[PDB]
Recover the amino acids of this structure.
C-alpha cells in the first residue's frame, strides 16, 4: 500500500490507457481475457512502445496473460483492477 | 504489503542474485551506486537475460538507475532493500 501507491504514482499514460481499456472491456478474469491485437487496434501506439508497456504492466503484476496457441490474451489481476478503480475514478 | 509480498513471491533467481549483490556491495543510495558492468562481470549471465532482469527490477521499483554519461549505475531503492533483508535473511 505504501509500496503499492508508489507503483501507482509511477504509471505512464500508456499504462493507464491499456488498463482502463481492459477494464472497460471487463477483461478481469482468464475466461474474460482479450487478445492483444484487439487492444492494439484500438490504441494507436508503436510496437516497442506497446510491447514495453505490456512487459512492465505484467512485471508489476497488474495484468495476466493467457498463452496457448493463437494470439495472447490479457486480463486485469486483483492489483491491476485496484489501479483502475483508483486512478480513473477517484 | 499484501501486494508487496505478492511481488516478493514472484522473484526469479536472477532477481535475487543481482539484489543481493548490490546489497553486499552496499549500493543502497545514489552516491553508493555501481556501474552495470561491475555486476555483470561478477555474474555469469546472458545479455537479454541480464537485461530483462534489470528491466523488471527497475519496473517494480526495486532498484534505482543513475544516468549521465559513462556507464549506468545502480542502487537498491527503499523497497529493493526490504526485499533483501527479507528474502536472503529470513
Amino acid at each position: 500500500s505504501d509500496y503499492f501507491e508508489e507503483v501507482m504514482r509511477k504509471l505512464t499514460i500508456e499504462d493507464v490507457s491499456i488498463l482502463g481499456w481492459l477494464f472497460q472491456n471487463e477483461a478481469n478474469a482468464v475466461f474474460k481475457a482479450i487478445k492483444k491485437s484487439s487492444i492494439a487496434d484500438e490504441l494507436e501506439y508503436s510496437t516497442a512502445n506497446f510491447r514495453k508497456t505490456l512487459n512492465k504492466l505484467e512485471a508489476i503484476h497488474f495484468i495476466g496473460t493467457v498463452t496457448g496457441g493463437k494470439e495472447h490474451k490479457l486480463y486485469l489481476t486483483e492489483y491491476g483492477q485496484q489501479a483502475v478503480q483508483q486512478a480513473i475514478h477517484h
Q: What stands out?
A: The first strand of chain B starts at residue 34 and ends at 35. Chain B has one domain: 1-90. The radius of gyration of chain B is 12 Å.
